Amino acid sequence: MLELVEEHRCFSGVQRTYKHDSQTIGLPMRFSVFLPPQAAHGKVPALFYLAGLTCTEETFAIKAGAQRFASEHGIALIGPDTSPRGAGVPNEGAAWDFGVGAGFYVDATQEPWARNYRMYSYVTQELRTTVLAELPVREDRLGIFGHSMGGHGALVLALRNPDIYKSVSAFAPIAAPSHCPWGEKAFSGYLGDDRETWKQYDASELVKSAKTKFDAGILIDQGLADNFLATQLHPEIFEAAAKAAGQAVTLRRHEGYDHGYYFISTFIGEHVAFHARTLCA
Amino acid sequence: MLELVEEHRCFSGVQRTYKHDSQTIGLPMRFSVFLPPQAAHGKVPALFYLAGLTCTEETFAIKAGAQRFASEHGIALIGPDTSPRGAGVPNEGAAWDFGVGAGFYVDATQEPWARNYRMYSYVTQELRTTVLAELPVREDRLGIFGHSMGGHGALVLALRNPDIYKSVSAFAPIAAPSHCPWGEKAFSGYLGDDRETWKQYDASELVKSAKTKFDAGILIDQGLADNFLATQLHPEIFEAAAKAAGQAVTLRRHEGYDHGYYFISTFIGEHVAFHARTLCA
Numbered sequence: 001m002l003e004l005v006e007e008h009r010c011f012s013g014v015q016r017t018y019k020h021d022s023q024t025i026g027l028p029m030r031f032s033v034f035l036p037p038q039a040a041h042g043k044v045p046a047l048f049y050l051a052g053l054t055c056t057e058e059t060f061a062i063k064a065g066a067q068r069f070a071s072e073h074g075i076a077l078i079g080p081d082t083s084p085r086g087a088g089v090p091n092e093g094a095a096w097d098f099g100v101g102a103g104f105y106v107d108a109t110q111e112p113w114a115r116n117y118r119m120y121s122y123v124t125q126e127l128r129t130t131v132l133a134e135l136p137v138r139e140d141r142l143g144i145f146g147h148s149m150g151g152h153g154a155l156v157l158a159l160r161n162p163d164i165y166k167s168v169s170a171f172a173p174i175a176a177p178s179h180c181p182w183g184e185k186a187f188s189g190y191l192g193d194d195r196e197t198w199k200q201y202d203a204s205e206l207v208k209s210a211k212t213k214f215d216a217g218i219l220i221d222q223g224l225a226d227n228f229l230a231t232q233l234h235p236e237i238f239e240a241a242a243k244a245a246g247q248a249v250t251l252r253r254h255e256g257y258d259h260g261y262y263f264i265s266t267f268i269g270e271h272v273a274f275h276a277r278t279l280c281a
Numbered sequence: 282m283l284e285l286v287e288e289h290r291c292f293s294g295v296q297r298t299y300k301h302d303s304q305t306i307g308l309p310m311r312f313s314v315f316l317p318p319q320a321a322h323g324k325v326p327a328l329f330y331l332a333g334l335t336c337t338e339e340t341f342a343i344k345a346g347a348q349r350f351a352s353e354h355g356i357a358l359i360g361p362d363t364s365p366r367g368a369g370v371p372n373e374g375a376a377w378d379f380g381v382g383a384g385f386y387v388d389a390t391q392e393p394w395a396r397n398y399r400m401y402s403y404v405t406q407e408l409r410t411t412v413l414a415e416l417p418v419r420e421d422r423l424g425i426f427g428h429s430m431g432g433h434g435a436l437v438l439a440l441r442n443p444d445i446y447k448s449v450s451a452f453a454p455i456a457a458p459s460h461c462p463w464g465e466k467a468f469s470g471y472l473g474d475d476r477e478t479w480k481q482y483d484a485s486e487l488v489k490s491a492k493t494k495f496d497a498g499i500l501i502d503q504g505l506a507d508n509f510l511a512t513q514l515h516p517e518i519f520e521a522a523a524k525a526a527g528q529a530v531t532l533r534r535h536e537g538y539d540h541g542y543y544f545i546s547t548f549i550g551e552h553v554a555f556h557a558r559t560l561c562a
Binding site: 011265 | 344349504506535538544546
């Protein structure tokens with residue numbers, strides 16, 4: 001059941017890692033939790049942060065410096081892992097861009113990935129209800145953000161679940177996975193070769209039909225020196241689709257910033273404030 | 282010569298890593314540099330941060346979240362490595378508490394360490410003058426801080442060089458290395474069996490005879506859940522010695538906090554503010 005395997009006091013709250021037996025994944029999963037000092041006095045809003053390729057549930061906790069801002073605003077931070085671990089699927093670790101550390105936040109339909117690679121259901125349902133049942137977190141004040149594969153994850157999960165996520169932001173998301181190699185490989189393997197099945201997991205397609213209730217729209221930060229800007233991320237495709245659909249998007253482009261956590265750390269404080277304007281309302 | 286090998290924009294400044302051919306070490310060395318935005322219009326004060334056992338030049342840059350505070354106060358951050366790298370001394374990597382990653386910021390006098398393990402002279406002279414010659418840093422506004430072996434280093438280097446280091450603070454320092462296993466092993470190996478020679482690298486011994494005083498005081502943060510508090514750190518010994526010599530020390534003990542960077546990150550903003558009181562005068 002629910003096991004506390006790591007805990008460190010941090011900005012007058014606690015940075016924890018839990019392990020639990022996931023019924024949706026069918027395997028043990030680890031996730032990180034930051035509780036701010038305010039959680040001692042009642043339930044608090046929470047943000048789910050989704051990490052990118054090769055990352056773990058601890059990458060964000062170590063590298064983003066988000067806990068100070070979570071403590072300042074009274075928001076908990078939940079960090080899922082990026083894939084199932086130790087599923088024993090043949091060659092699930094043969095590449096870093098697919099399989100282990102590379103679940104792409106989809107529910108796989110193709111064998112042999114469909115048995116365990118159910119990260120969409122895991123993050124939006126089982127992990128959420130576990131957090132709500134066992135931690136002092138408000139069910140009605142949840143937001144989501146993430147980086148790259150995780151920024152793809154944050155946009156997709158928010159646009160598909162308006163009943164759950166009240167705010168959404170992203171750092172350097174894979175904005176149009178149907179049209180870059182990382183996404184086309186992931187979708188081909190997990191979902192099959194029928195591109196129509198991929199649209200339900202593509203932020204740029206979802207925004208064309210989404211009905212949203214975001215007070216301050218969708219926040220995206222993108223570094224202009226990002227090595228993946230033209231080869232994988234394609235923010236302009238999402239920006240154009242959201243404009244045609246009338247969806248408010250604040251896409252901020254920053255000259256000279258790269259893809260990684262020196263970039264993410266610079267803007268994560270503004271992201272936590274952005275979410276707090278909705279979640280702490 | 283001076284090679285820029287990493288650079289990422291961060292909090293409107295730059296996080297850099299440099300490689301240079303060290304004459305004092307006799308080998309290439311890597312060091313980290315954070316320049317705040319203010320360094321673009323003039324020289325800025327600088328803080329040297331010394332890392333603990335097993336760390337590298339980038340541990341602080343990645344894990345401490347200090348750049349945000351340095352950018353607010355206009356302080357550069359310089360992070361030396363913890364030891365020579367690739368010196369080829371037999372078995373120098375046999376144990377994690379000695380040799381590689383474990384220079385203890387001393388100048389070794391015993392062979393075979395004496396050839397390259399000159400981290401005291403490296404940090405206080407060669408690295409300092411390289412920084413002052415090649416980067417927009419004020420010679421008269423330098424301070425020093427660090428963690429564990431690096432907290433030992435920060436205290437030792439400040440108390441020995443009051444005309445260099447104008448402010449000093451520490452996270453969980455090895456406060457009396459002559460009286461704990463980490464220090465006894467390192468000093469025995471690097472310095473030999475004459476314990477008198479160890480007193481010049483022992484913060485608790487140095488404070489007993491320090492003539493000059495830091496009138497802004499010495500700031501030390503210690504977590505009470507730290508696993509090394511009673512086995513290696515001994516903050517009480519330095520406290521007792523400082524009290525008896527009239528050196529003001531603010532030793533803050535924090536219930537529940539551990540040894541690592543969730544603890545360090547929590548207080549590093551207060552440390553940069555503390556140093557800025559003197560360095561940004």
